[PDB]
Design a protein around this ligand. Structure first.
Ligand SMILES: [Zn+2]
Ligand SMILES: [Zn+2]
Ligand SMILES: [Zn+2]
Ligand SMILES: [Zn+2]
Ligand SMILES: [Zn+2]
Length: 362
């Protein structure tokens, strides 16, 4: 329908989400939406299949690459506070990288996966800081800087790591002691403390075994975050219109800058954005493997550009046992967060989210 109100919103959300849980055998999902800036919460199923613990808005889910939006915000915050400038060469912020290829890569290129073909993951044996440093120092670019986007955990991971170091604090400390408290996120973690473990969902693998995230070099930066729908929606609210800390406001704003595009998807810091309104087909294409699995030449921007409020900003994320999606449209006052403890297809996430956002826009 094209009617608004509480009744049609529930009919739509329940009607979209429930069949999807069944189709993909998703044990639990927490959903939260914004309509005209007002929040609505929908919880389904269980966080722990063994115990029967029900999902709530406080259940912690792994959000995979959605973590990169927080990593990017931390990076932006460091930039605002004077740790670095986006056009600085990476090696200006890493002495051990002087003389390497990172003499010719900018901090922005690193953050936006356009440094020149840094891979999706580190090679298998690169699993200590010393080995990581050797890896980057030795790395040889596949493409000229700024020309190709290849989604890469080593890329944005190094950006986060160096951004935090530019303020003289480790990444996890800056995140837990400053960024999350300033955003007012009090139940969001990289390392989940004992006191919060009771709310931590289990993920469920393709083999249907309970699983949680793998530790790793730069895992904090790449996929470190555990959070529930209520905290994640508050982070989304901060991205809709934030009035408070000027520095944090500036940092958030900087994550809405566009640097290049692949098709109709424009890459920012963390967030990837589209026109709004946008068709389901376009949103599916921009979130397809051909854009995330693979290297693509980019449509370059002459200069980075503030993308503004009339955009759909989004990010997908997954781990072995979890599947997350977040999208928001600042000008329209609408948003969706969908957190599940199964890694179910991105196409389904996008189709559900598009249907729900269409109803929220009424
Ligand atoms: Zn309508
Ligand atoms: Zn409601
Ligand atoms: Zn090792
Ligand atoms: Zn370091
Ligand atoms: Zn707190």
């Amino acid at each position: 329908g094209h009617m608004s109100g509480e009744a049609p919103l529930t009919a739509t959300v329940d009607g979209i989400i429930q069949p999807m849980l069944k189709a993909y055998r998703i044990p639990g999902m927490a959903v939260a939406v914004l309509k005209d800036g007002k929040a609505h919460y929908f919880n389904y199923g269980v966080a722990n299949r063994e115990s029967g613990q029900r999902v709530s808005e406080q259940t912690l889910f792994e959000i995979g690459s959605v973590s990169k939006t927080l990593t990017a915000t931390l990076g932006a915050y460091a930039a605002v506070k004077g740790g670095f400038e986006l056009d600085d060469k990476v090696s200006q912020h890493a002495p051990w990288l002087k003389g390497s290829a990172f003499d010719g890569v900018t901090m922005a290129e690193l953050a936006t996966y356009s440094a020149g073909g840094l891979p999706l993951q580190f090679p298998d044996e690169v699993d200590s800081n010393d080995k990581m440093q050797t890896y980057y120092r030795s790395w040889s670019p596949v493409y000229p800087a700024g020309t190709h986007r290849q989604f890469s955990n080593p890329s944005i991971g190094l950006f986060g790591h160096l951004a935090a170091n530019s303020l003289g604090q480790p990444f996890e400390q800056l995140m837990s002691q400053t960024l999350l408290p300033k955003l007012g996120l009090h139940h969001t973690y990289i390392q989940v403390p004992e006191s919060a473990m009771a709310n931590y969902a289990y993920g469920y693998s393709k083999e249907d075994k309970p699983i949680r995230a793998t530790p790793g070099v730069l895992a904090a930066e790449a996929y470190g975050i555990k959070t529930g729908s209520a905290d994640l929606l508050k982070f989304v609210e901060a991205n809709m219109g934030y009035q408070g800390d000027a520095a944090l406001k500036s940092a958030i704003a900087l994550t809405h800058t566009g640097f290049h595009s692949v098709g109709e998807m424009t890459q920012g810091l963390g967030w990837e954005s589209y026109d709004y309104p946008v068709t389901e087909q376009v949103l599916l294409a921009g979130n397809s493997p051909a854009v995330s699995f693979q290297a693509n030449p980019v449509t370059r921007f002459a200069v980075p550009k503030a993308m503004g409020e009339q955009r759909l900003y989004n990010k997908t994320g997954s781990t072995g046992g979890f599947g997350a999606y977040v999208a928001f449209v600042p000008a329209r006052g609408i948003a969706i967060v969908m957190l599940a403890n199964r890694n179910y297809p991105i196409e389904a996430r996008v189709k559900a989210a598009h249907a729900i956002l269409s109803q929220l826009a009424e």
